[PDB]
Design a protein around this ligand. Structure first.
Ligand code: CU
Ligand code: CU
Ligand code: CU
Ligand code: CU
Ligand code: CU
Ligand code: CU
Lengths: 329, 329, 329
């Protein structure tokens, strides 16, 4: 088959790709490097992270149904842990986990066939209690497998997006020193038992988009124009989320994230099941600031699950009008 | 366009409306008054509430796809907080939130076009940490936007209900004095920091239908007759729910609440995502007492999420028979 | 009508049945015996269980749409509690709960008509706070009502499984002595108030498949061959779950569990709402060990929600290949 190398782009952006397959089935070559480092989640909150390619989430890989994926996965000798990769996109051997367990100072090359259209989680799954821990330390990302024929809608007609953003949501369980401030550690394995106690409560301390509170606000703010049709790909590897575009809708929404299923239309809020990725297409009609949230508003605001979209274009007063500005009684 | 004033009815009832639009697109005029007051949730549990029109949930507004909604929202000078309104039904400016921030002693008139069929949450969203707090103090309600053509079923055939009930479910985070009894405060802003600590645990103290434990039982019991086709509209602005009609089913169910999507049929239990509203139609076949619950039974029973329906009519022994009454071994 | 006695098989197995109804509507006779006993959940964790037929979950009953179900339910005099049964499959009288409340030393015979196709929860529901408590002590199981015509797929074409496994997931709230070890009691009613405090936190101590941590691993490991089409029926009577077959997919999935609704296809992870049962069909393509998990990985690994499937057959390298084994850098 033809082979194609890919240069990965950190999220929320996506490496170049076609929607409808230009050619026939190819072998997609990706490479990633595992990086264990301490990341900042908030004003005063840090995480002993473990990443695919330095980012939470790991980067978006894009392919077409029928392609193959050949990934060189590498674990640099400065890392303290073994790691692997389970693609929910793949069939066999625990999604590839049973063939990619590599130690600090090793590499592995896995190939699988993308038989199934949709967005899918990939995450590290070293075995036993290492599974939850590596994932809640950030080791998860997404792979989107587009139908060859491009995206189809509910009645089977083509739909094309102008922009895909990859929203990687992730829940984290930072333990606290006695003083009620968040603990810091020199390495992950040092933080282990304290993180466990927090995990067993099933209450996350943080829940963030693209790695940290406010990561997709401020200079990280997502961008678009009125008339833009944007695909929002949203992953949650360990815990449910309920995405909502404040001031918008999901025009077409595959909440279970698999493109040969009919999308739902006109959604206020949709549902991403822990261990999955979903996709919502929206065409912006109104300019201005939007928020993209997890709509448990405690999770959106106290925990970190809020992104911003800045949209320019022409205001349409038909859709919305302030008839009487805030005047006194 | 023709304009129509509406007099709102507190939930679980609904102001008069037609299913299929009598006329063409009109401008629907609603008015609401924000009321900050202390409400009773349980035997010994109170909440520094903040309401649309004095009720939790805020009242149901009904319109047709293509109409406009013009709401006069009013914040009386005895209220201590600014407030606004975000309709998930609306497009632009944070669902209208960015155009309706009014202080104690002001009003605003917002118009938007109901472009999209379904039931939708509206809630107050003052900005930042005010967003979760105002919502978990009761400031949320629903607006149902019926297709002009009335309700259609899965194969496109019309369906009509004889009764709509609006079930507003709401989660609340009442803090506790040291003695393990629920705290009371003289105003909301006095209760703030104590409520926050509870909110950060993501465990609600109460979860209620129409404002309080047992609010839709006893004299609040919902009512119907065998042969009645009842639409149950159910909102949860901040947290997931799994509604179930004990002794019944959901005949046709839009769990994501948007009417141009095919309903599911024969459901034992459905799923309302936090930040959304859903709708289930049921035709009563058996008379007697039913319970409508959130089917995490700890939430239904220990937290407040239980309503009753009292149904009269003829018992059909074909569907269910006690063959041998409780006799000894 | 013809009558048919059934001998129940404990889960995850299923009594013999046909997929497409051999004959016309019959009266299905089942009998169950309530057993209150202490069960082991983990290495050092026990539960004052209350069961249908000695097992968690209660056994799978299978019938066809249009049949009747006549169950003799029996509560032996050594039991300390009254109990009943609510079938979500049934119509009227709180799913049969209002006609089957029997004391220690009594029996009852209930008949209902299975008007509705799908898998459905049945659980004990004695009234008030007894409802959550009996269910979180294990009193719940499932009844699957197959269409007469057998299983149909999304385009209406027949689908047949070679094996049904019944995965009964269940959440439990074991209290702790002061020393942080799990409490033990001599009877259920002795454990009551301590279990309540845990329940009110809505954090389960355990979440298990077929009764106990590791119950469906080791010698309990589920089994199949490449080319086997397996139906996985999955119930959660009180709390949401997100099932995922590690290394596999859900080929056709009724996550709300009702067979006259179109299934979804190609799912990585699906969603079982508390108070319901779902069904996923998968055709094994790759041999080896798979895990079937609740994909909140903290629930899967720290809490007990993990099963194993052992699959033999021929490895297909097209689907997955280890191109370069774990070699050094
Ligand atoms: Cu890892
Ligand atoms: Cu996984
Ligand atoms: Cu407010
Ligand atoms: Cu909202
Ligand atoms: Cu019982
Ligand atoms: Cu139930």
């Amino acid at each position: 088959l033809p082979r194609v190398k890919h240069t990965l782009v950190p999220p929320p952006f996506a490496h170049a790709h076609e929607q409808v397959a230009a050619s026939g089935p190819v072998i997609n070559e990706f490479e990633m490097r595992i990086i264990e480092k301490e990341v900042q989640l908030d004003e005063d909150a840090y995480l002993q992270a473990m990443t695919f390619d330095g980012s939470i989430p790991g980067p978006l890989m894009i392919v077409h149904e029928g392609d193959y994926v050949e990934l060189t996965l590498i674990n640099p000798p400065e890392n303290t842990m073994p790691h692997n990769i389970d693609f929910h996109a793949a069939t066999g051997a625990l999604g590839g986990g049973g063939l990619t367990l590599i130690n600090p100072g090793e590499k592995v090359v896995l190939r699988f066939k993308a038989t199934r259209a949709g967005a899918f989680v990939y995450h590290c799954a070293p075995g036993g209690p290492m599974i939850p821990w590596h994932v809640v330390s950030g080791m998860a990302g997404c792979i989107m497998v587009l139908p060859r024929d491009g995206l189809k809608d509910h009645e089977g007609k083509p739909v094309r997006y102008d922009t895909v953003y990859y929203i990687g949501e992730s829940d984290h369980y930072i333990p606290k020193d006695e003083d009620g401030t968040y603990m810091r550690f020199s390495d992950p394995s040092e933080g282990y038992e304290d993180m466990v106690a927090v995990m067993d409560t099933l209450i996350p301390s943080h829940i963030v988009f693209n790695g940290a509170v406010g990561a997709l606000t401020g200079e990280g703010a997502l961008k678009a124009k009125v008339g833009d049709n944007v695909l929002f790909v949203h992953s949650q590897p360990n815990r449910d989320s309920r995405p909502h575009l404040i001031g918008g809708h999901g025009d077409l929404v595959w909440e279970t994230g698999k493109f040969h299923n009919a999308p739902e239309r006109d959604l206020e809020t949709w549902f991403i099941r822990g261990g999955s990725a979903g996709a919502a297409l929206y065409k912006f009609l109104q300019p201005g600031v939007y928020a993209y949230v997890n709509h448990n508003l405690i999770e959106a605001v106290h925990k970190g699950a809020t992104a911003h979209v800045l949209v320019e274009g022409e205001w349409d007063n038909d859709l919305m009008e302030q008839v009487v500005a805030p005047v006194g009684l």
